[PDB]
């Protein structure tokens, strides 16, 4: 319900996931990111759960090499740290 504004480097990766505006539910920019995970097939291709980005910009951003699309608690502080 309540609104956020993901910094520019964060939406730049939402709008190559099919984003088509700048402000977000979480709900919406996890959808957009899960997304881009299935996109850019950065999950291992036998623990289904394991995001690699070491080599991505989701990498980056989110100041990880690997984390699992289960851990949620982890995953909201890796996208916070992306929102004006
Ligand atoms: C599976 C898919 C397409 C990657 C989407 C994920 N699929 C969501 C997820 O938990 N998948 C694992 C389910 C597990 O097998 C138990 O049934 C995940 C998600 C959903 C809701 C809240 C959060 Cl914080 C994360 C997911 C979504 N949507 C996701 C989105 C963005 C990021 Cl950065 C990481 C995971």
């Given at each position: 319900?309540?609104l956020v504004?993901?910094?520019?480097?964060?939406?730049?990766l939402?709008?190559?996931?099919?984003?088509?505006?700048?402000?977000?539910?979480?709900?919406?920019?996890?959808?957009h990111?899960?997304?881009?995970?299935?996109a850019?097939?950065?999950?291992?291709?036998?623990?289904?759960?394991?995001?690699?980005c070491s080599?991505?910009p989701?990498?980056?951003?989110?100041?990880?090499?690997?984390?699992?699309?289960?851990?949620?608690?982890?995953?909201?502080?890796?996208?916070?740290?992306?929102?004006v």
């Amino acid at each position: 319900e309540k609104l956020v504004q993901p910094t520019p480097l964060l939406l730049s990766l939402l709008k190559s996931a099919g984003a088509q505006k700048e402000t977000f539910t979480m709900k919406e920019v996890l959808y957009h990111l899960g997304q881009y995970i299935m996109a850019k097939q950065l999950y291992d291709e036998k623990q289904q759960h394991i995001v690699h980005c070491s080599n991505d910009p989701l990498g980056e951003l989110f100041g990880v090499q690997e984390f699992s699309v289960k851990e949620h608690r982890r995953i909201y502080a890796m996208i916070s740290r992306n929102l004006v």
